[PDB]
């Protein structure tokens, strides 16, 4: 449909089943709905692990770099997945969340030690 503006965004369309998420890493307009019209599909993301304990993420790097060069914006989960894959540097939000998790583990260990004596 016609839009007054908007920008191309490579995001995740949550297309799946109840209690079973499944994201399609797709490049679409910013003003379109999440499961609406899109430009070109790039990859897939499975949040839940499979029988092998592996989380499958699909990236079409050739199209991803082309669209990013054309001027496609990226979402925070998209940047996180790209940093995990290694095509992009690790997002500092992941680093600060890891630091917070480490501090929480240290606090939990201290509380467990002080609740035992």
């Amino acid at each position: 449909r016609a839009y007054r503006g908007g920008h191309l965004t490579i995001r995740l369309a949550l297309g799946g089943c109840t209690n079973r998420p499944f994201y399609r890493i797709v490049a679409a307009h910013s003003k379109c709905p999440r499961d609406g019209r899109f430009v070109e599909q790039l990859g897939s993301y499975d949040p839940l692990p499979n029988s092998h304990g592996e989380k499958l993420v699909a990236l079409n790097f050739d199209r991803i770099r082309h669209w990013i060069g054309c001027g496609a914006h990226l979402s925070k989960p998209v940047e996180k997945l790209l940093g995990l894959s290694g095509f992009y540097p690790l997002h500092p939000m992941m680093i600060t969340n890891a630091e917070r998790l480490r501090r929480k583990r240290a606090r939990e260990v201290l509380l467990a030690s002080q609740k035992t004596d």
């Binding site: 790097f61 894959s85 290694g86 095509f87 992009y88 540097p89």
Partner: protein, 213 residues
């Protein structure tokens, strides 16, 4: 799209002219547009409430036009700074005012639009830019006896590296791409940052229309 039975609508076109005329004839003047109620922090014109973090500076500081009104020629060649710049940036950041048009509708004469030259972090721009955020209650003026002292800035070269290592996956991609063609050079690839320089969020932007070249 284009049909044989298209009705030549005229009311819709006349409404565009009516709204265009009412936009200019009833244009809200910037004085009452930016008028502020200092008790409830509510704008009488727009009806939006100011941020909680901005409640202190509104009551404890002054805006640009509230201090520029007492100057003889509305600050021709004067240097004006900001509280936020003074706090965050130790390097001098000032605006040299070249022209000011205060709004005549204000009874207290504390609103207007000014242009000038921006010198942020000691870097002097050779172009004239319209002053942004005039209504902000953070502007401060420097005296004449300190005008020369505040401009004292030292040019220290930056220590930012010009090249950075590639991410591991892209580095492997490049290594495989050149290896397939047969380049036996095992030189470390680097990503350039010469054109990656970006301005800080405190750096004001220009308010003039962009010219398409």
């Amino acid at each position: 799209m284009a049909r044989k039975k298209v009705r030549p609508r005229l009311i819709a076109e006349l409404a565009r002219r009516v709204r265009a005329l009412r936009e200019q004839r009833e244009r809200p003047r910037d004085s009452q547009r930016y008028a502020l109620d200092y008790e409830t922090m509510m704008r009488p014109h727009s009806g939006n409430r100011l941020p909680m973090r901005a409640w202190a500076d509104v009551r404890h500081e002054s805006r640009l036009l509230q201090l520029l009104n007492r100057l003889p020629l509305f600050g021709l060649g004067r240097l004006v700074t900001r509280k936020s710049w003074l706090w965050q940036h130790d390097e001098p950041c000032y605006w040299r005012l070249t022209r000011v048009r205060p709004d005549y509708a204000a009874e207290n004469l504390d609103h207007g639009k000014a242009w000038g030259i921006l010198t942020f972090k000691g870097k002097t721009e050779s172009e004239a830019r319209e002053i942004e955020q005039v209504m902000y209650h953070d502007w401060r003026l420097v005296p004449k006896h300190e005008e020369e002292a505040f401009t004292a800035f030292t040019l220290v070269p930056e220590d930012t590296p010009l090249s950075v290592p590639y991410p591991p996956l892209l580095r492997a991609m490049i290594l495989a791409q050149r290896q397939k063609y047969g380049d036996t050079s095992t030189e470390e690839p680097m990503l350039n940052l010469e054109r990656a320089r970006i301005d800080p969020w405190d750096y004001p932007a220009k308010l003039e229309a962009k010219t398409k070249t």
